[PDB]
Amino acid sequence: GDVTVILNNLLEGYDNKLRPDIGVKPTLIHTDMYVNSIGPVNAINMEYTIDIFFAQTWYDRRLKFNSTIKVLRLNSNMVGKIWIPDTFFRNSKKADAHWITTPNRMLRIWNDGRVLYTLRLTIDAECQLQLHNFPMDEHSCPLEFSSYGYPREEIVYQWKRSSVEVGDTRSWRLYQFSFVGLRNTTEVVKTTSGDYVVMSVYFDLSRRMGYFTIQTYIPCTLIVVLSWVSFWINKDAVPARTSLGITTVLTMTTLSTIARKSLPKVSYVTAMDLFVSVCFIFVFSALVEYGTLHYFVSSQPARAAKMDSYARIFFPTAFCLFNLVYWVSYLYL
Amino acid sequence: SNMSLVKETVDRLLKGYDIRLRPDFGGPPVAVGMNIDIASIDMVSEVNMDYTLTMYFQQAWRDKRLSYNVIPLNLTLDNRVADQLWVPDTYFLNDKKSFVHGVTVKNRMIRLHPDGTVLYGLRITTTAACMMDLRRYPLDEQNCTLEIESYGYTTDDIEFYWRGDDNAVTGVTKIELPQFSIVDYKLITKKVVFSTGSYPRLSLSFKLKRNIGYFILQTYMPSILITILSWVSFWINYDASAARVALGITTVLT
Amino acid sequence: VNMDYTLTMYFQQAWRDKRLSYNVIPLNLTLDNRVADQLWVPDTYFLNDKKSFVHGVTVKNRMIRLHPDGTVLYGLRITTTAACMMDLRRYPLDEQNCTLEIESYGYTTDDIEFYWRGDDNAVTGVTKIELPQFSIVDYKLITKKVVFSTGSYPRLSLSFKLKRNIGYFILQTYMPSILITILSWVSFWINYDASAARVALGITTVLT
Amino acid sequence: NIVMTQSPKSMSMSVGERVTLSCKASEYVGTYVSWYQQKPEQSPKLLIYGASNRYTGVPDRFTGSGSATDFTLTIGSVQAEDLADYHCGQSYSYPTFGAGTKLEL
Amino acid sequence: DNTTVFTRILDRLLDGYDNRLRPGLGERVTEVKTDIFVTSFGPVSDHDMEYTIDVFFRQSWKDERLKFKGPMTVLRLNNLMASKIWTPDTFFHNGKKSVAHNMTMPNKLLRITEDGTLLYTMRLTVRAECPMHLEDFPMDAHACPLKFGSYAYTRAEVVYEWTREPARSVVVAEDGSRLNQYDLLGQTVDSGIVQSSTGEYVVMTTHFHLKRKIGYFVIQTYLPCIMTVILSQVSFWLNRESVPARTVFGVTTVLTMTTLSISARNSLPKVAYATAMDWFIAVCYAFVFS
Amino acid sequence: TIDVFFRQSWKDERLKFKGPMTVLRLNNLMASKIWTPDTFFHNGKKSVAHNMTMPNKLLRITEDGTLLYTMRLTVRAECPMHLEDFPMDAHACPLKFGSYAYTRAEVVYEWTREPARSV
Amino acid sequence: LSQVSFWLNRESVPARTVFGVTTVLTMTTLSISARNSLPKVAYATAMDWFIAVCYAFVFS
Ligand SMILES: *[C@@H]1O[C@H](CO)[C@@H](O[C@@H]2O[C@H](CO)[C@@H](O[C@@H]3O[C@H](CO[C@H]4O[C@H](CO[C@H]5O[C@H](CO)[C@@H](O)[C@H](O)[C@@H]5O[C@H]5O[C@H](CO)[C@@H](O)[C@H](O)[C@@H]5O)[C@@H](O)[C@H](O[C@H]5O[C@H](CO)[C@@H](O)[C@H](O)[C@@H]5O)[C@@H]4O)[C@@H](O)[C@H](O[C@H]4O[C@H](CO)[C@@H](O)[C@H](O)[C@@H]4O[C@H]4O[C@H](CO)[C@@H](O)[C@H](O)[C@@H]4O[C@H]4O[C@H](CO)[C@@H](O)[C@H](O)[C@@H]4O)[C@@H]3O)[C@H](O)[C@H]2NC(C)=O)[C@H](O)[C@H]1NC(C)=O
Ligand SMILES: *[C@@H]1O[C@H](CO)[C@@H](O[C@@H]2O[C@H](CO)[C@@H](O[C@@H]3O[C@H](CO)[C@@H](O)[C@H](O)[C@@H]3O)[C@H](O)[C@H]2NC(C)=O)[C@H](O)[C@H]1NC(C)=O
Ligand SMILES: *[C@@H]1O[C@H](CO)[C@@H](O[C@@H]2O[C@H](CO)[C@@H](O[C@@H]3O[C@H](CO)[C@@H](O)[C@H](O)[C@@H]3O)[C@H](O)[C@H]2NC(C)=O)[C@H](O)[C@H]1NC(C)=O
Ligand SMILES: *[C@@H]1O[C@H](CO)[C@@H](O[C@@H]2O[C@H](CO)[C@@H](O[C@@H]3O[C@H](CO)[C@@H](O)[C@H](O)[C@@H]3O)[C@H](O)[C@H]2NC(C)=O)[C@H](O)[C@H]1NC(C)=O
Numbered sequence A: 001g002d003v004t005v006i007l008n009n010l011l012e013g014y015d016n017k018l019r020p021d022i023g024v025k026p027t028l029i030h031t032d033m034y035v036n037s038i039g040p041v042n043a044i045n046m047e048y049t050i051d052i053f054f055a056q057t058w059y060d061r062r063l064k065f066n067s068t069i070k071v072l073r074l075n076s077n078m079v080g081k082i083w084i085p086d087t088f089f090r091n092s093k094k095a096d097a098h099w100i101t102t103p104n105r106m107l108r109i110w111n112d113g114r115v116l117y118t119l120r121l122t123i124d125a126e127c128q129l130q131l132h133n134f135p136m137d138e139h140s141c142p143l144e145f146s147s148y149g150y151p152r153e154e155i156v157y158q159w160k161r162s163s164v165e166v167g168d169t170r171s172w173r174l175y176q177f178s179f180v181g182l183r184n185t186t187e188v189v190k191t192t193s194g195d196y197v198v199m200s201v202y203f204d205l206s207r208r209m210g211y212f213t214i215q216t217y218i219p220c221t222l223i224v225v226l227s228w229v230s231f232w233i234n235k236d237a238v239p240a241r242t243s244l245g246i247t248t249v250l251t252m253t254t255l256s257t258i259a260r261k262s263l264p265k266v267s268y269v270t271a272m273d274l275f276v277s278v279c280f281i282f283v284f285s286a287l288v289e290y291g292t293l294h295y296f297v298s299s300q301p302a303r304a305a306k307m308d309s310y311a312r313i314f315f316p317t318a319f320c321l322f323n324l325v326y327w328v329s330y331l332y333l
Numbered sequence B: 001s002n003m004s005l006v007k008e009t010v011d012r013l014l015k016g017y018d019i020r021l022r023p024d025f026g027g028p029p030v031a032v033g034m035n036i037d038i039a040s041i042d043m044v045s046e047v048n049m050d051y052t053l054t055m056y057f058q059q060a061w062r063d064k065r066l067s068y069n070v071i072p073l074n075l076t077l078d079n080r081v082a083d084q085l086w087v088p089d090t091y092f093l094n095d096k097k098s099f100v101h102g103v104t105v106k107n108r109m110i111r112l113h114p115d116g117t118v119l120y121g122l123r124i125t126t127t128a129a130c131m132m133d134l135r136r137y138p139l140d141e142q143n144c145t146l147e148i149e150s151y152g153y154t155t156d157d158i159e160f161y162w163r164g165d166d167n168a169v170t171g172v173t174k175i176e177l178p179q180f181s182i183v184d185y186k187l188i189t190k191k192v193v194f195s196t197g198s199y200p201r202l203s204l205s206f207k208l209k210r211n212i213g214y215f216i217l218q219t220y221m222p223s224i225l226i227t228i229l230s231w232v233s234f235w236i237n238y239d240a241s242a243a244r245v246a247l248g249i250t251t252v253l254t
Numbered sequence C: 001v002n003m004d005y006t007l008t009m010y011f012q013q014a015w016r017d018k019r020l021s022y023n024v025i026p027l028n029l030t031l032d033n034r035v036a037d038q039l040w041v042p043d044t045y046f047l048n049d050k051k052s053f054v055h056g057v058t059v060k061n062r063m064i065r066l067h068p069d070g071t072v073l074y075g076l077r078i079t080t081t082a083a084c085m086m087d088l089r090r091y092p093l094d095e096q097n098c099t100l101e102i103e104s105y106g107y108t109t110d111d112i113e114f115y116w117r118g119d120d121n122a123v124t125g126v127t128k129i130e131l132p133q134f135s136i137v138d139y140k141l142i143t144k145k146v147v148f149s150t151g152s153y154p155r156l157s158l159s160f161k162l163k164r165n166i167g168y169f170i171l172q173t174y175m176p177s178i179l180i181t182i183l184s185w186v187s188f189w190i191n192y193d194a195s196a197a198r199v200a201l202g203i204t205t206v207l208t
Numbered sequence D: 001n002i003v004m005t006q007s008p009k010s011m012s013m014s015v016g017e018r019v020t021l022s023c024k025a026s027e028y029v030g031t032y033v034s035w036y037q038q039k040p041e042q043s044p045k046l047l048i049y050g051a052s053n054r055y056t057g058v059p060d061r062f063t064g065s066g067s068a069t070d071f072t073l074t075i076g077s078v079q080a081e082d083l084a085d086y087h088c089g090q091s092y093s094y095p096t097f098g099a100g101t102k103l104e105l
Numbered sequence E: 001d002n003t004t005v006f007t008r009i010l011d012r013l014l015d016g017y018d019n020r021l022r023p024g025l026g027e028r029v030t031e032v033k034t035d036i037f038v039t040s041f042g043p044v045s046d047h048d049m050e051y052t053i054d055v056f057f058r059q060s061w062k063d064e065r066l067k068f069k070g071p072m073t074v075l076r077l078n079n080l081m082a083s084k085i086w087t088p089d090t091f092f093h094n095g096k097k098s099v100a101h102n103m104t105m106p107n108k109l110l111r112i113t114e115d116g117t118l119l120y121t122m123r124l125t126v127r128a129e130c131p132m133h134l135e136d137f138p139m140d141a142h143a144c145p146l147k148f149g150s151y152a153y154t155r156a157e158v159v160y161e162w163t164r165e166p167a168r169s170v171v172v173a174e175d176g177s178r179l180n181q182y183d184l185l186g187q188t189v190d191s192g193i194v195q196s197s198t199g200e201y202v203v204m205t206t207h208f209h210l211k212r213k214i215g216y217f218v219i220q221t222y223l224p225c226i227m228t229v230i231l232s233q234v235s236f237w238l239n240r241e242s243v244p245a246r247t248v249f250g251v252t253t254v255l256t257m258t259t260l261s262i263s264a265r266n267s268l269p270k271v272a273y274a275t276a277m278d279w280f281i282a283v284c285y286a287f288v289f290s
Numbered sequence F: 001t002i003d004v005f006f007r008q009s010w011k012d013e014r015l016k017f018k019g020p021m022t023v024l025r026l027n028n029l030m031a032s033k034i035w036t037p038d039t040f041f042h043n044g045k046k047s048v049a050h051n052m053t054m055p056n057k058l059l060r061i062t063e064d065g066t067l068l069y070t071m072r073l074t075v076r077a078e079c080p081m082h083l084e085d086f087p088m089d090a091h092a093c094p095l096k097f098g099s100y101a102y103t104r105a106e107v108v109y110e111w112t113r114e115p116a117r118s119v
Numbered sequence G: 001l002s003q004v005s006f007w008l009n010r011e012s013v014p015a016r017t018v019f020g021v022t023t024v025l026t027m028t029t030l031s032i033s034a035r036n037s038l039p040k041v042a043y044a045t046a047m048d049w050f051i052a053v054c055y056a057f058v059f060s
């Protein structure tokens, strides 16, 4: 009817290469979001998937009409004919909008020129996780976005009071982590082209320790007590105790390989490989203890007889002390 | 108003413009200056013999046709006008897959200046292929680069140079790698000679040095401890034939 | 593991368009592959494909070829990763059977008619396919008219029958298990006084 | 330099029988050996280009047989005018011709 | 106004140009001269029986509809002008998924000489096929072909040829070898004529002769097999009154041989014949069992 | 993953005609010159619309304006699972699709047959 | 195979030791291979409880 006439009058003498007020003042853009789901945070690539509904609203004095209808509600068929800011996410490894079935976009041009432009995004953002205290570690890793070609003097972003709103926090794919909070931040960065307004949203993720427990902490200690069992077998049965020790060492190194293969290649010492190395050292100590016991049996038997009962008390006590110290130091940190 | 003036200036610049002709199509070569802001070197694979890096590749040339004097400000046009201007045919020789990121728009900048200087930036993610010499793994230093060359235009049609010659590449000292460490980086400007002509070429070469802590902790320590556990078999008396054989065999298996 | 199979074919269609009929020149015109964006070409789709593409090097690999009587030929070079649902109740001694259903999408049976050209020499190059594991035993061409809630659409089927070779499995998993059982049998010739030797034999055998 | 040993060096055949000439290269020359017919006081005329491909104007009795190294040229039922020199020459590298075979009756 | 006179030249050049008809549609046969400059011979994958390559595909024909006389001899035009003229539709008969790099602009090149001779160069990665016979594994030698011809243009319309001597056409860069395991010996070009269901086409074939390096397979299969056999034959020097030790020797050597026979076979595609490494592994297993 | 024939049908009063045929079985390229609803899947991750060999779409314009627009999709949706009975568990994998940029006061969706016989 | 270790006589120590150790190793690798199939989830499944009980049995 007359809405076609309005849309035709808005695009007569319209240049979609020039931002509104190109030579007057910067364009204030209000940005909102809606985090549907924060996908799996894989430590190997130091990245995490997020799915958002990015909404940008600005003022355009050229798309200003005066008719009975107050607001124009449009699909993505009029996005390529008006000006659209070139907001890009500075820490996204690979990100893309959705196109099924029709391009997921929304354009609402109010009566006074205020435009709202909403799109759906699936961003594989990047954040370098400091993999210390593993797996009792907490991260706060961001999502930063800014204009690409427009510096601070041309496009200025600004959060709304209730801008970012998480979803249900129940149907998310956060397996090993647990959402505890978020915070918005705005700063200005320097680049080879100029000064840019960079907005950020920091998500705080806390690794819940329910899986790595049964994956490495239970089998390692059970392997260690398997090694301790040799301290009760009679000292005359040599092959039994040697097999115990050496096969326990083999299983220990295999389990250490798996545990270290969990997270990526990092050149520092975490809290999990520290645990598996202490367990490996304990099994090594048990084996060399039996070796010295057997060597001393030929020289003086009572020495080894006392050594056995001494080790029976010294080994579990040292293990329990180390476990207490380690867990206290790495949990309350 | 100022917007009408800007609109008429841009409509004047883009009217009577031929994309098939570089600036000075008969005269001297065009001078394209390169800047690079490396965001991150994502992954360095020894199995595929390549690495992935994301950069803000930026070029700056002087197009005497896009010159204006009625307004003093630097126009920043929409990134869709780069299909109506001339931009140099710069390609990376050792790339395998690359893509300008396209969220929320095609990530490129195209900014004109009042003296004609055009500034064209991209956000590329190139999987450069660099072959490694693993004869000293993991106590080795890789030196593998990124080569930037012009495809269509020979050296009498285009000239590449770094802008600043030492600040053209930034963001290297801020890169953290989980396994490597950037020792230094070099910027080389030269010419290659193919069967069709002599073409310009730039090279940004990194010298990564591999860390040793993870390898020691993961596969050097178990080797030494298994060797010592093998030595343990010497304290066992020669009468026990089921113990020393078991120790040696299991150490071999480990 | 994906229950699929990737095949590259030269898929050619030939119809009769009366509007592309010329009687001035006597030669069979062959136009660039870019004129196909201005003709009508049938909306053919493979029903059981998952990811497919017309090869685009050095150009979009398609052929358009008119004829002086209006007949049009239209060939593509497709690489379809079709779905091959397998019954593995006899693996690796099984004969598989997976098809390639070629159906027209938009046009009912009163708007298009599919038929193999030759009806036996339509599909060539099957006896030249040399697979590393399977071996094509037979292929059959079928012509049906499927019925959906929006009409009755034509359908062609090209069906293979791949027989899996058993040499590799005889090499990899049958022979080691057989020799491991033979090894386990040695545990009887050892004297029954040896308590660690026979247990070592049995345990290593179970573990292998 | 790829040397071409053409055989036989001199052969005589009567009219009406199939004659076979051979030309064996040293290295690989893949279907890139041409056969020329040089009558006396005349310039050579190309007979068989490629490996087995008659030049436009060549009778159907000349036909070639190609390979990677060894090549043959067969003339079924030679006439009285087929008496000339027959040179094989490769072109996979810089062209090097054979010694030629004198055809007599 | 030099850009203006060149724009006038290019506008007069495409006045009445039909980019759907080859030069000399009914009056001649097109002669496309081909050339290849392999910048990098990628890694030959043994499982997929494929090999990657990265070439500079140069083509050149003569289009009389593009004759021009001006201040310059050759026109080094953009890569988008090549979409408004006729360009041959060469395709690789044994390509799987090849890409034509377009970073940053489309990687192409067009030089229009003043007498109509065109030069059209592309930079493209071809992921070609290379069927292998692995009966001499890992001491085999292959000839990985790279066939390319025309699509939709038979032998009567478009014929291909090499521009320089066929030996000096397919060039390889010096540092252009990403072969970790193989070793490129040399190229070998050839021309042929194939017959399809549509017509009779011209096919340009190029073989790259490869020769596998035994260095890895030695240290990873032949060394452990020989070491296991030696460890097993050590069992004879022990005394006969030691049953557990000799039994452990035997069973551990058998387990090692089994794990090795399973692991080493995993590398190769599932072929139905026995390679050489399989014969070595079988003989070592027979020795341990003996 | 789920391979669907997503069918839609609205009534456009601006597409009434009067000719020899009743239903215009048009080509899939006419669907871009008319209005077609932008139905998006609320939980789909990476859905593809197939392009072999031509765009797998359909358009039948009935003489009274009743349109019909089917696509062939391959939807990869999210199915949140509670793996507390693994491997004796039962799941209910949802597939939610609605409109984008069109609220309830503008575009309402409805099944075309009895809701038990639509999917 | 672990509970079989009870029918052997008390004089043969290395045999019972081998039984015990190899059954514990098999249970460890089975637990790992069973957790590998699932997503890295932070609760305990039914199969996890079954494998824990079997581990308790072999260790006992
Ligand atoms: C190197 O080479 C690469 C390979 O060629 C190249 O990649 C290509 O890049 C270009 C440039 O970006 C892409 O072209 C654009 O793609 C946009 C969306 O891209 C998505 O979709 C395509 C598939 O495109 C189909 O789907 C969209 C969405 O529905 C349609 O809009 C398309 O027309 C097309 O639809 C047909 O096909 C469908 C089947 O798929 C059918 O169902 C349908 O019916 C049609 O038949 C995907 O391939 C993309 O994936 C790639 O990109 C993502 C990006 O993140 C990558 O991650 C991924 O890995 C892939 O690489 C992606 O998913 C299109 O929207 C866009 O079309 C608009 O823009 C152009 C340019 O401005 C216009 O000319 C055009 O007319 C369109 O404008 C209209 O529509 C917009 C809608 O927003 C309106 O706003 C606008 O006003 C205008 O409306 C007018 O026309 C309408 C009709 O068109 C009409 O309805 C209106 O009323 C009005 O009149 C453009 O096509 C191309 O897809 C890439 N291809 C590939 C294979 O990657 C790369 O860039 C090269 N690199 C360099 C450096 O050069
Ligand atoms: C990594 O390897 C590359 C290539 O192997 C090294 O690049 C080489 O760098 C040297 C030093 O600049 C270049 O030599 C120079 O030649 C110019 C010629 O005018 C001369 O003026 C200089 O004095 C110097 O001799 C050499 O050409 C260059 N080679 C290539 C192929 O680019 C690089 O130095 C290595 N190290 C690092 C940290 O990148
Ligand atoms: C899916 O398949 C369809 C059908 O083949 C593809 O549509 C075709 O897309 C190309 C590329 O945009 C169109 O070519 C264009 O033609 C216009 C003239 O209208 C020209 O100005 C452009 O420069 C370009 O050459 C082509 O016309 C179009 N087919 C039809 C019938 O219109 C579609 O691109 C395919 N999608 C993907 C992702 O491959
Ligand atoms: C592979 O599987 C397909 C389908 O599972 C087999 O195709 C089936 O072949 C039989 C025998 O040709 C068809 O029966 C036919 O019925 C029609 C009814 O008129 C009759 O005219 C024919 O003479 C024949 O009796 C059957 O319809 C067809 N399956 C379907 C769904 O149409 C195929 O034989 C199997 N083997 C191979 C080597 O492909």
Ligand SMILES: *[C@@H]1O[C@H](CO)[C@@H](O[C@@H]2O[C@H](CO)[C@@H](O)[C@H](O)[C@H]2NC(C)=O)[C@H](O)[C@H]1NC(C)=O
Binding pocket: A159, A160, A161, A163, A182, A183, A184
């Ligand atoms: C998101 O950003 C907004 C604006 O930057 C924050 O809103 C401010 O909240 C503080 C209290 O925390 C008030 O004192 C300010 O007046 C608010 N600003 C405005 C403009 O209303 C909001 O707190 C941020 N959300 C966080 C940090 O979670």
Ligand SMILES: *[C@@H]1O[C@H](CO)[C@@H](O)[C@H](O)[C@H]1NC(C)=O
Binding pocket: B072, B073, B074, B113
């Ligand atoms: C345009 O850029 C130049 C380069 O630094 C700068 O000197 C000038 O001030 C800029 N113009 C404006 C209006 O800021």
Ligand SMILES: *[C@@H]1O[C@H](CO)[C@@H](O)[C@H](O)[C@H]1NC(C)=O
Binding pocket: C026, C027, C028, C067
């Ligand atoms: C065109 O094709 C037909 C059949 O393929 C053939 O009979 C005819 O000879 C062809 N035209 C010419 C001019 O050869």
